[PDB]
DNA sequence: TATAATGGGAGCTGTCACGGATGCA
DNA sequence: TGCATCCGTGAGTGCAG
């Protein structure tokens, strides 16, 4: 553009302030993209929403927070020896034993049963006395045969496993400690695995935390007027943003940063220039600045 | 092409806030002005004069004026100077920069995004003595007011809030412009108080009222004579311009004489007396007609009653109140010859 | 000072003739 | 380039009014 040239008012904002446009998704249906999220035109947004420009995608109103929290924790289980396959660890997914046939799991203690389900997969403490006596875990391919809140004497059948079984996907084998005894090997798995807490966002509330950070207990998640309805992080997890009020398709660039940062919001600035980290980061794009 | 029309278009631009960004951008600007204040404790500086480099710097620096009331003149020099001891800060302190300048840029939005109100506002206040236009600015004059001071806490939509400064002002020039003569807002309010009043009367009455009539509805304190001189300044000027006759070669101000620049039969007059004065000043004493001829003045006058009198004439204090009376006394019978001064008194 | 309120409203009519500056096959 | 076509400017004197 030169000088002494008639731009309109829309043609002087895109100048000036830069392109973008935000879109509304029905009220519930979900993002097929996510935050942080560079796309370009054409593609597909929502189940009828679809963006028209070029850039990075940003996320306006989560209505629904969830905090996979973390879990690492030890328990066991015994099988025969004739049917697992000796591993140090077991990668998610990854198949452990393979049986002949259905060969019942039994308990090895007497309490009552807390059933704790899983996507795929299951968790049994049992407990006498509120302390906690034994903590089995059933992988895929062994289905329980209990109720949460059961009782149990020592031998008799907690579950059933049925040919070849494997972890599941959420949860890990960190290390795997075995001991054999008669034609049979019982298993302490230091498992890992993380569960989910779906939290509400309310209009007059606001997420005070990025896709994906890390929160130990006492973390402040979204802040709202009356400091009761606030949500906090009860203990270790990482965070996710899903279901937002509408996206805006800004048509920038994103630099993130470790340390203070040099620029303030507004500030308007060229390729070369100094953003933030003593030097490290710098412009790639003529813009304008949002902190 | 029509510069209402146009206005409704650049408003049609900024679209509707959604209940969310009303409390976001809300929320954003009370944030920004704590963080102001915060970061004035930490610097000192001053609320204000901080305030007004976070707005220079959001803003751009296309605008820029020496705000009256800040101490110095906010010349760009000052705003890197101390857009500098400002942003020279460690991260947990240069925290609320990034906090007030995010917030002078919701106050933007949230009143561009509020405009529309104005509108359906002021529309309803029309045929008053202001402008569509000018009331519209007044009216948005106001909603700068609502922004400054809302309190989102309080889970209100904005608009119930600044519904109330918006009317605010549109009343407030449409009693403090509207006249040519400016009255306080005051008494125009107690105007408006006997045009009502009195237009009930009159609905009451099949005719209008007296002014009598009109103190009694009025209460207490309100005698006839009151309510006349209240009328009297109620009274707008006229135009000079006004135009008179059917064809339209004659103004209502050129059939009214000017009073103040005197006539050539009274400024000739005037040079007729004070020289046929001095016409009997030397004709019996030039220092007893001029003892006397500081008693008063040719032009200026010089008339007190007993201090300079006292303090050079040549002569003592009531020494010169007699030649005084003898200046007078000769001036009586001096005028009973030269009996040209009695027409001057008409 | 706090329910909520978010894009206006009247056009006016039956003259004429010339010269200059702007738009268009 | 020549020629529609629009916009802005004028449109008698004085006196009563």
Redesign the interface.
Same mark, same amino acid.
């Given at each position: 553009v030169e000088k002494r040239q008639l731009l309109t008012?829309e043609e002087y904002r895109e100048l000036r302030y830069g392109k973008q446009e935000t879109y509304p998704l029905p009220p519930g249906v979900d993002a097929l993209v996510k935050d942080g999220e560079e796309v370009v035109k054409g593609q597909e947004l929502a189940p009828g929403v679809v963006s028209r420009l070029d850039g990075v995608a940003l996320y306006?109103?989560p209505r629904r927070v969830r905090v996979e929290y973390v879990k690492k924790e030890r328990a066991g289980l015994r099988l025969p020896l004739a049917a697992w396959v000796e591993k140090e660890a077991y990668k998610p997914g990854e198949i452990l034993a393979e049986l002949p046939e259905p060969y019942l799991f039994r308990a090895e203690e007497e309490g009552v049963v807390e059933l704790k389900e899983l996507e795929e997969g299951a968790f049994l403490v049992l407990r006498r006395e509120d302390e906690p006596v034994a903590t089995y875990f059933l992988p895929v391919g062994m289905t329980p045969l209990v109720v949460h809140g059961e009782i149990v004497e020592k031998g008799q059948p907690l579950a059933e496993a049925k040919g070849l079984l494997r972890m599941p996907r959420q949860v890990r084998a960190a290390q795997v400690e075995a001991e054999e005894e008669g034609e049979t090997v019982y298993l302490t798995l230091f498992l890992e695995w993380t569960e989910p807490k779906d939290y509400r966002v309310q209009?007059?509330m606001?997420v005070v935390v990025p896709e994906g950070a890390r929160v130990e207990a006492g973390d402040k998640i979204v802040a709202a007027?009356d400091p009761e309805e606030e949500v906090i992080a009860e203990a270790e997890g990482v965070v996710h943003l899903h279901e937002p009020?509408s996206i805006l398709v800004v048509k920038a660039r994103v630099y993130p940063f470790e340390? #203070?940062?040099?620029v303030?919001?507004? #500030? +308007?600035v060229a390729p070369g220039d100094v953003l933030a980290d003593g030097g490290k980061v710098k412009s790639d794009v003529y813009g304008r600045v949002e902190? | 092409s029509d510069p209402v029309r146009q206005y409704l278009h650049?408003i049609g631009?900024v679209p509707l806030l959604? /209940? @969310?960004?009303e409390? @976001?951008l809300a +929320?954003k600007v009370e944030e920004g002005m704590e963080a102001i204040k915060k970061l004035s404790e930490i610097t000192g500086l001053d609320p204000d004069l901080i305030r007004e480099v976070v707005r220079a710097?959001? /803003?751009?620096s296309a605008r820029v004026r020496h705000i009256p009331g800040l101490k110095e003149t906010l010349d760009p020099k000052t705003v890197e100077e101390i #857009?500098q001891k400002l942003?020279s800060l460690?991260?947990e302190h240069?925290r609320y /920069?990034?906090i007030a300048?995010?917030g @002078?840029?919701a106050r933007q939005h949230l009143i561009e995004a509020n405009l529309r109100l104005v509108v359906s506002i002021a529309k309803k206040y029309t045929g008053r003595g202001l402008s569509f236009l000018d009331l519209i600015q007044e009216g948005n004059q106001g909603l700068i007011r609502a922004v400054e001071k809302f309190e989102?806490?309080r889970?209100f939509k904005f608009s119930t809030y600044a519904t109330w400064w918006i009317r605010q002002a549109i009343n407030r020039a449409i009693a403090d412009q509207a006249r040519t003569i400016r009255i306080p807002v005051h008494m125009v309010e107690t105007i408006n108080k006997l045009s009502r009043t009195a237009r009930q009367l009159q609905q009451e009455l099949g005719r209008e009222p007296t002014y009598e009539e009109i103190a009694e509805a009025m209460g207490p304190g309100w005698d006839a004579k009151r309510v006349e001189e209240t009328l009297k300044i109620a009274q707008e000027p006229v135009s000079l311009e006004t135009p008179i006759g059917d064809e339209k070669d004659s103004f209502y101000g050129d059939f009214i004489p000017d009073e103040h620049l005197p006539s050539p039969v009274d400024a000739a007059t005037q040079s007729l007396l004070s020289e046929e004065l001095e016409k009997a000043l030397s004709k019996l004493s030039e220092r007893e007609a001029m003892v006397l001829k500081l008693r008063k003045g040719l032009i200026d006058g010089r008339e007190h009653t007993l201090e300079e009198v006292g303090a050079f004439f040549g002569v003592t204090r009531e020494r010169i109140r007699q030649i005084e009376n003898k200046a007078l006394r000769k001036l009586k019978y001096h005028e009973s010859r030269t009996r040209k001064l009695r027409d001057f008194l008409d």
């Open positions: 008012d306006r109103f209009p007059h606001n007027i009020a340390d #203070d940062v040099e303030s919001t507004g #500030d +308007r902190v | 650049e631009q959604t /209940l @969310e960004e409390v @976001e +929320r710097k959001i /803003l751009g #857009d942003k460690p991260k240069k /920069l990034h300048r995010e @002078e840029a989102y806490k889970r």
